Amino acid sequence: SVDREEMIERFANFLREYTDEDGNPVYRGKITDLLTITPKRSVAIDWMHLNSFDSELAHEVIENPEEGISAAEDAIQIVLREDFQREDVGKIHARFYNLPETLMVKDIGAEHINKLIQVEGIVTRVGEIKPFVSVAVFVCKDCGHEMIVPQKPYESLEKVKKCEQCGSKNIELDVNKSSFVNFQSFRIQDRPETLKGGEMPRFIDGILLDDIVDVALPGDRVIVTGILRVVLEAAEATPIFRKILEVNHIEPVS
Amino acid sequence: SVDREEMIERFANFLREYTDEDGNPVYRGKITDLLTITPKRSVAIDWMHLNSFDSELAHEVIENPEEGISAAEDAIQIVLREDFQREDVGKIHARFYNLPETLMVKDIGAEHINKLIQVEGIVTRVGEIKPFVSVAVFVCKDCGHEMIVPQKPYESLEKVKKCEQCGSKNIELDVNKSSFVNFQSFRIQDRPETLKGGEMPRFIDGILLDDIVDVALPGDRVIVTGILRVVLEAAEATPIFRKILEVNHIEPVSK
Amino acid sequence: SVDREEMIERFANFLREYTDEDGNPVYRGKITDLLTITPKRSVAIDWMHLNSFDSELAHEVIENPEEGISAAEDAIQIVLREDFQREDVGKIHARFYNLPETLMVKDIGAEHINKLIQVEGIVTRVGEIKPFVSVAVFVCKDCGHEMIVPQKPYESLEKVKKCEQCGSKNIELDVNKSSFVNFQSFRIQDRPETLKGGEMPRFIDGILLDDIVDVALPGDRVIVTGILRVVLEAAEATPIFRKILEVNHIEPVSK
Amino acid sequence: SVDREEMIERFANFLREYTDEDGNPVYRGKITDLLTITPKRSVAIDWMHLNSFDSELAHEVIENPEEGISAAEDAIQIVLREDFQREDVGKIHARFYNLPETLMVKDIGAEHINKLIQVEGIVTRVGEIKPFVSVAVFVCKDCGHEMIVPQKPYESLEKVKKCEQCGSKNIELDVNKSSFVNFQSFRIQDRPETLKGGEMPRFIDGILLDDIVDVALPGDRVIVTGILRVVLEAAEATPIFRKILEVNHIEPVS
Amino acid sequence: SVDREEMIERFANFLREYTDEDGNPVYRGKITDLLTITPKRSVAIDWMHLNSFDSELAHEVIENPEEGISAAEDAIQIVLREDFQREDVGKIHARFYNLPETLMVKDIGAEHINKLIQVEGIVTRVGEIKPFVSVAVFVCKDCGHEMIVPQKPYESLEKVKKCEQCGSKNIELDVNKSSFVNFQSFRIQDRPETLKGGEMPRFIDGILLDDIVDVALPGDRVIVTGILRVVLEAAEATPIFRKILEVNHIEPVSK
Amino acid sequence: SVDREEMIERFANFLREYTDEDGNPVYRGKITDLLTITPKRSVAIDWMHLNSFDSELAHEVIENPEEGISAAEDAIQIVLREDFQREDVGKIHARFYNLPETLMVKDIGAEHINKLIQVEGIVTRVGEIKPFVSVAVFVCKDCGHEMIVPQKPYESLEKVKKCEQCGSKNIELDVNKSSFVNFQSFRIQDRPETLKGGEMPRFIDGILLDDIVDVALPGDRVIVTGILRVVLEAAEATPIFRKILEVNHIEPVSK
Ligand SMILES: [Zn+2]
Ligand SMILES: [Zn+2]
Ligand SMILES: [Zn+2]
Ligand SMILES: [Zn+2]
Ligand SMILES: [Zn+2]
Ligand SMILES: [Zn+2]
């Protein structure tokens, strides 16, 4: 695979040196869109672009999306500081799109977990937009010690039983220190027309976070990319699970 | 007894302060968990806890479950607002369990009317799930005045005779404005294995609302807490009554 | 949302202009066909079409099916008059199908009240076909004043108390003046093959009017779209409700 | 994380330099047991040993067992050649044991996929010992071109539709070129005595391969280590899965 | 017709050589898959394939399904042995499907006795699953001689009168030595939707063995192939017969 | 495997020597207790104990329960005689429980024939208690010769054709000489709560003898161990079999 601190620097180069098939730089100018009056919090990275410039890195994102994204997101944090003297901007998302292979929803499940994939389908329903605790800061009300606990949006709220410093159980969730974002679930499946006659269509549930919330309605034809997650479904004599797609990038199909 | 305002205070306290013998802030943690992405709509409260922390209040929810349960629900809403800055959060139920006495169905008398009881028995039947109007919003077709009327699932629907404001006798219940929850009847009785030979087992009908509907099938042995109600027999106009159990909490025995 | 006058415009547009990916003017062609010697009394509209052409309007018929369906039917009548010089043509239904979400019977909650839903399931029962008064014409025996009163098949008959004009309390429903259509109840439920072991299948009653009556027998598996209604349980005066599905479109699954 | 070619060399050092808390080398002599009249095909590596000598590597095995093992197995292949002039020995397994944390069976499922874990429980049943195609060699009967396809024991036999060289569909599985091993499933759960009164015990199914087949009978109390795998269970409207434990090392509890 | 030895040759060929219009070696691939860790115990053979590759043989399995089916099973066993060096592999069934003609239950006559037919209909009933002795091993209590006797699930058990070797009339069936498979009866009939008004639907009983037992529930519409049997009515000693369908292959219609 | 003489030795050992993790001589203590004024007629043996002490023997009682159970019962009789000088003591059963695998009723196949299995399920039915002849003493009316014939409760009564000694064909079963024990049938099945939706629960009939008769009523959930038997369906002369569970040990789940 590839060293983590190295991907960071390898992405910075992509972000800078790249220019498309007409000889025009592009990611320099996407980064500037982060500093308008109404900024964005996301940088859409074409993967065909990243592969034609750095094939060995592009195949590492897919193989390890969790690290691959986290890396590219540090490389954006840097380039904003080195090429634009900014360290005030805060969290920026790196959303990859236009991957090599496009799955139909039915083809997922056969697919492997924790790997970046691309799916095309139709949205059948979307949830209530609700606040998600993405970072929980617990506080000992006895000694004062703070404890940070990061959260996965596909697992319930994880907490801490006792204070790691003084051993006290008298802890509370500090809502102010903690970090919240928007959350919105949705469900896609394969469009009836792309299936055979007596073929039951299949579905998968997704998670949208922060700034890609409220991006879609039912009936929308879409192309999402994200990471599959295995989630508990029922704790039977032996547990069964399902697969949900934590979305990294979504756009409508044209 | 205790007035509402004060019960709510006493409850909000219990929730925040109570700790078990190990020092876990049980009810703080449960309320904390309502901030999870897919929360419960109930908070179960061990009566023995409430009793050890505020015995007068604990004995008060048995005597006046309707008040106590309501107070405890308002307390929860307060803690969510005050200690977690959560507002939009919906109704959260306070369900009490583990009362000091467990009755057999044959022991449930009309003296227990409108108090909280705890019964053990086996489910004989379970009704079909239907919607029930917890909150009926009526609307005048003339002035468009909106009158809110709460209902009880064991009493008949309470309509309005005439508009309270414009005086019009032309009001209907507005379905879109009103609030509904799931409803499901069920029946428990004493198992024959617990009775004298020859003894006819006694039963009682209950009601399950909202998030405890469809929690039991026939053949299940359960422990329920609930407010006993005695309602006039609809069957006739005679002075014979019918015991109904409005369930507050239900769990299966041995789990 | 959209006011009636404007929906009708937006609909008439859709009908005339919409074309599929191949360029066929689907709804023009269907309306054209109403000029055949033995026409249909309905025009089925693929929701996904309406959505791709006028998404705001499409999401509007789900939110307010009663309005949307009514608007679309007025639009059809317009196109027949304007583009085909056809007047006498009777009522033509607008039946929407292929909604984005398909519910199981067990998922149909009272939150869906008065919205359009799409359900899949198996027909358990089918009622006897009877006449229903879509339009009740009442007539005063004194002045001969005629009062028109529309009805809903899931509500009780709305009569008139007294003559609106001469004030007489002597009016009867005139059968010859009134309009009737076929009516037929039916029931669908989830197939056990789709539930957890031990799970009791849930069901729901529906209503078929006019030209979709007698379209299904028991055993059929179907997909219906319809406006969910929640009506007070006639069984009693209690606050318990009953879900009824007023079917807008029905087709068998897989065909 | 760590570079792959590097773990190899890092393991070779462990295998050589290590000596226990009494000052005696150990893995030098385990490797010689591979060259007796009746050799072994496995080297049991204590993890407490690997952690006390190379903490950063030991935590990488657990985090990436698939690579971590494959690495340590190359490092054994080497050390047999460099310190014992042998490249004839063939496939040797690296089986890690005595990990930091021991799960009860019930605690699995909550556990993460593709990570080395350790479980204690009791065997309730064991399967028929049967031959598993671990490496499938397909052959084009037209041009002659060979195609190698490696197999996962928790997924059905994977094949190839057509010849990658000449495009022909006239392919056959060459049983002689292909590689087979023993396979035997089994099932463990938590011992009734370590559970509460009205507590339904939970189970998990395991896979034993090659030389660790037939190692256990029902009733045996055991400590296995392995990698969890998510497997399809039923292709419902949305697919459900289960978790099975591909075993890396098994021994009875004393 | 064809003798057994030669059918097996012709079948082994078909399996190995057959390719579809795209060039896929269908039956090679299916047999290849029996080497997977959890294999099937059947190989389904499209009759239309066999027909296009060896028409005389194909028409032979309809005329003599018992022979053909047996030959095809021996062929499979050969290919596994010869081309995959697999021996221990158990019995593998050859199940034929997609025959040229599909009968309605009302068309199945006794002329079809002992031939292969293909029927479409709806499952009315499904029996309880029971064990059936495919291979009865008898054992003499005196000499310990072992006599193997195959059985048919539609005929009565064929015992042995006396030991074939030591002549002893003291033999019993040995259960441990014998082979059993699952058995399950079922019944199909024509759907009334396919008959004249007033017509009484006709039915027929079938048998499912081994790995096709418990494949259908009532209400399922299916297409089955099977050997028709006509057995004397056990009901009496009269000369009236009963049609039974010994199913070779079953799949649901429309899938 | 192990011959009878040697199993008995190995068993007698286990009984005497076995100790748990705390050092209690469990089976010594149980056998000691048979000297109490009102003893049991059974000694329950935890399989996991026998397995930890003599694994080969333990796996042997599963493979050959009839032998193993019989051997263990002879061992008990020995220990009572040798270590307690007790002779007159009647038959004492050896009932094994807590086997390594627990089957669902649907998993019990004829491969388990004549082995020991452990099943979990719910009692659907319980038969009437009747007497069964464990030991049939037949008596010749001419010479007065006595022939002992043991019986199995799942097979038909084995009589004697003619007197073994005087050759007379005139023998009857002597009731006073014979031994009887209580007999009771029962039936268990899988609970629907444990099956796929739509799945028909499977069941199995069992037999309780002597001191475990009348131990369960319908509705009880139980864990049984027993020797599976497959007996020919008496219903007919067909080759279809019937699974019957000859219960060795039964206890209710969770207690
Ligand atoms: Zn602290
Ligand atoms: Zn008013
Ligand atoms: Zn008038
Ligand atoms: Zn080739
Ligand atoms: Zn003989
Ligand atoms: Zn005699």
Q: Which ligand is nearest to the CA of B170?
A: 2
Show the tokens assigned to C172. 């009867």
A88 Cβ contact list (under 8 Å, min separation 6): none
Show the tokens assigned to E223. 């297409």
- Which of A67, A109, A237 is the closest to D200 by Cβ? A237
Which residue numbers of E have CB closer than 8 Å to C's CBs?
Answer: 193, 217, 219, 254
Q: Which residue of C has its CA nearest to A199?
A: C254
Instruction: Please choose, from the candidates A111, A113, A106, the residue with its C-alpha nearest in 3D space to the C-alpha of residue A191.
Output: A106
CATH 2.40.50.140 is right for the domain spanning B102-131+182-255: yes
CB contact under 8 A, B193 and F217: yes
CB contact under 8 A, C198 and F195: yes
Rounded to whole angstroms, the Cα distance separating E132 from E146 reads 20
Residue length, chain D? 254
DSSP SS3 for C193: helix
Q: Are the C-beta atoms of residues B187 and B205 closer than 8 Å to each other?
A: yes
Residues in chain B closer than 8 A to A169 (CB atoms): 19, 22-25
Q: Are the C-beta atoms of residues F134 and F151 closer than 8 Å to each other?
A: yes
CB contact under 8 A, C98 and A218: no
Q: Where are the beta strands (DSSP E) in chain E?
A: 42-46, 93-97, 103-104, 116-126, 130-140, 146-150, 171-189, 203-209, 221-232, 241-252
Mutate to test the interface with F, among E126, E130, E233 (most CBs of F within 10 A): E130
3-state secondary structure B182-221: EEEEEEEECCHHHCCCCCCCCEEEEEEEHHHCCCCCCCCE
Please state how this structure was obtained: X-ray
Q: Are the C-beta atoms of residues A241 and A231 closer than 8 Å to each other?
A: yes
Q: Are the C-beta atoms of residues B215 and B250 closer than 8 Å to each other?
A: yes
DSSP F196: B
Name the amino acid, one letter, at D233. Answer: E
φ, ψ (nearest 5 deg) of residue E111: -65, -30
Place of tokens 């990611």: A27
Instruction: Please choose, from the candidates A124, A148, A127, the residue with its C-alpha nearest in 3D space to the C-alpha of residue A136.
Output: A148
Residues in chain D closer than 8 A to B255 (CB atoms): 198
Rounded to whole angstroms, the Cα distance separating F139 from F117 reads 38
Q: Are the C-beta atoms of residues E227 and E114 closer than 8 Å to each other?
A: yes
Do A and B share at least 3 CB pairs under 8 Å? yes
DSSP string, F216-247: --TT-EEEEEEEEEEEE-TT-SSSBEEEEEEE
Rounded to whole angstroms, the Cα distance separating C243 from C107 reads 12
Show the tokens assigned to E241. 């017969």
Q: Which residue of A has its CA nearest to D108?
A: A239
CB contact under 8 A, D122 and F102: no
Q: Are the C-beta atoms of residues D220 and D123 closer than 8 Å to each other?
A: yes
First-to-last C-alpha distance (Å) of chain D: 35
Looking at the DSSP bridge assignments, the partners of residue B170 are: none
Show the tokens assigned to C242. 């009953």
**Distance from the A38 Cα atom to the nearest Cα atom in chain C, whole angstroms:** 26
Going from N- to C-terminal start, the domains of chain A cover 1-101, 102-131+182-254, 132-181
Show the tokens assigned to D101. 């944390």
CA angle C12, C16, C17 (to 5 degrees): 115
Q: Are the C-beta atoms of residues B123 and B222 closer than 8 Å to each other?
A: yes
- Which of E130, E155, E173 is the closest to F242 by Cβ? E130
Show the tokens assigned to C240. 């318990």
Residues in chain F closer than 8 A to B254 (CB atoms): 254
Neighbours of D9 (CB within 10 A): 13
Rounded to whole angstroms, the Cα distance separating D183 from E38 reads 11
Which residue numbers of E have CB closer than 8 Å to A's CBs?
Answer: 254-255
Show the tokens assigned to D163. 């010849």
CA A112 to centroid of chain Cα atoms: 17
CB contact under 8 A, D217 and F55: yes
Mutate to test the interface with C, among B125, B132, B233 (most CBs of C within 10 A): B132
Touching chains, D (3+ CB pairs < 8 A): A, B, E, F
CA C123 to centroid of chain Cα atoms: 19
User: Half-sphere exposure of C157 toward its Cβ, with a 13 Å CA cutoff?
Assistant: 13
Q: Are the C-beta atoms of residues E225 and E188 closer than 8 Å to each other?
A: no
CA F43 to centroid of chain Cα atoms: 12
Per DSSP bridges, beta strands B42-46 and A146-150 are unpaired
What are E19-24's contacts with CB under 8 Å, separation 24+?
A: E19/D169, E19/D170, E20/E49, E22/D169, E23/D168, E23/D169, E23/D170, E24/D161, E24/D169
CA B175 to centroid of chain Cα atoms: 23
Show the tokens assigned to A210. 């922060």
Helix (H) or strand (E) holding C204: strand C203-209
**Distance from the C22 Cα atom to the nearest Cα atom in chain B, whole angstroms:** 42
- Which of D3, D114, D204 is the closest to A238 by Cβ? D204
Per DSSP bridges, beta strands B203-209 and B241-252 are parallel
Rounded to whole angstroms, the Cα distance separating A252 from B193 reads 65
- Which of B126, B132, B176 is the closest to C240 by Cβ? B132
Residues in chain E closer than 8 A to D153 (CB atoms): 37
Cα(A172) to ligand 1 centroid in Å equals 11
CA distances from C157 to B241, C128, E209 (A): 35, 20, 59
CATH of domain E132-181: 2.20.28.10
Instruction: Please choose, from the candidates C92, C90, C87, the residue with its C-alpha nearest in 3D space to the C-alpha of residue C73.
Output: C92
Cα dihedral: E141, E144, E145, E149 (round 10): 60
CA angle C187, C43, C15 (to 5 degrees): 140
CA distances from B77 to B5, B41, B80, B210, F67 (A): 14, 12, 5, 18, 68
Touching chains, C (3+ CB pairs < 8 A): A, B, E, F
From the options 3.50.50.60, 2.60.120.10, 3.40.50.150, 3.30.1640.10, give the CATH code of E1-101: 3.30.1640.10
Rounded to whole angstroms, the Cα distance separating A87 from A74 reads 12
Which residue numbers of C have CB closer than 8 Å to B's CBs?
Answer: 109-111, 113-114, 198, 200, 202, 230, 232-233, 236-243
Touching chains, B (3+ CB pairs < 8 A): A, C, D, F
CA angle E186, E189, E193 (to 5 degrees): 145
What is the rounded radius of gyration, in angstroms, for the C-alpha atoms of chain D? 20
Rounded to whole angstroms, the Cα distance separating C229 from C114 reads 6
Touching chains, F (3+ CB pairs < 8 A): B, C, D, E
φ, ψ (nearest 5 deg) of residue D101: -110, 135
Cα(A188) to ligand 5 centroid in Å equals 70
Looking at the DSSP bridge assignments, the partners of residue E208 are: E184
Taking one residue from A and the other from D, the number of pairs with CB-CB distance under 8 angstroms is 65
**Distance from the B200 Cα atom to the nearest Cα atom in chain F, whole angstroms:** 18
Residues in chain C closer than 8 A to A197 (CB atoms): 254
- Which of D153, D156, D169 is the closest to E25 by Cβ? D169
The fold of A102-131+182-254 is OB fold (Dihydrolipoamide Acetyltransferase, E2P) (2.40.50)
Listed resolution, Å = 3.2
E17 Cβ contact list (under 8 Å, min separation 6): E25, E53
User: Half-sphere exposure of F137 toward its Cβ, with a 13 Å CA cutoff?
Assistant: 10
**Distance from the F124 Cα atom to the nearest Cα atom in chain D, whole angstroms:** 22
Q: Are the C-beta atoms of residues E201 and E190 closer than 8 Å to each other?
A: yes
Instruction: Please choose, from the candidates B52, B97, B73, B54, the residue with its C-alpha nearest in 3D space to the C-alpha of residue B224.
Output: B97
Tell me: is residue D163 an annotated ligand-binding position.
yes
Q: Which residue of D has its CA nearest to F118?
A: D124
A11 Cβ contact list (under 8 Å, min separation 6): A57, A71, A72, A75, A76
Rounded to whole angstroms, the Cα distance separating C95 from C41 reads 10
Rounded to whole angstroms, the Cα distance separating B38 from A231 reads 14
Show the tokens assigned to B73. 């629900």
Taking one residue from C and the other from F, the number of pairs with CB-CB distance under 8 angstroms is 25
Place of tokens 């399904």: E65
Rounded to whole angstroms, the Cα distance separating D18 from D47 reads 12
Q: Are the C-beta atoms of residues B252 and B221 closer than 8 Å to each other?
A: yes
Looking at the DSSP bridge assignments, the partners of residue E103 are: E119
Rounded to whole angstroms, the Cα distance separating B55 from B51 reads 4
Cα(B140) to ligand 2 centroid in Å equals 5
Cα dihedral: D66, D69, D72, D77 (round 10): -90
Q: Are the C-beta atoms of residues B102 and B119 closer than 8 Å to each other?
A: yes
Place of tokens 């061990």: B46
DSSP string, A55-84: HHHHHHHHHSHHHHHHHHHHHHHHHHHHTT
φ, ψ (nearest 5 deg) of residue B219: 90, -25
Q: Helices F4-17 and F65-84 sit at what angle, rounded to 10 degrees? A: 60
Binding site members of E for Zn(2+): 140, 143, 163, 166
DSSP string, D155-193: SPPP--SS-TTT----EEE-TTTSEEEEEEEEEEE--GG
φ, ψ (nearest 5 deg) of residue F120: -115, 140
**Distance from the D156 Cα atom to the nearest Cα atom in chain E, whole angstroms:** 6
Instruction: Please choose, from the candidates B247, B255, B254, the residue with its C-alpha nearest in 3D space to the C-alpha of residue B119.
Output: B247
Name the amino acid, one letter, at D15. Answer: L
CB contact under 8 A, F240 and E131: yes
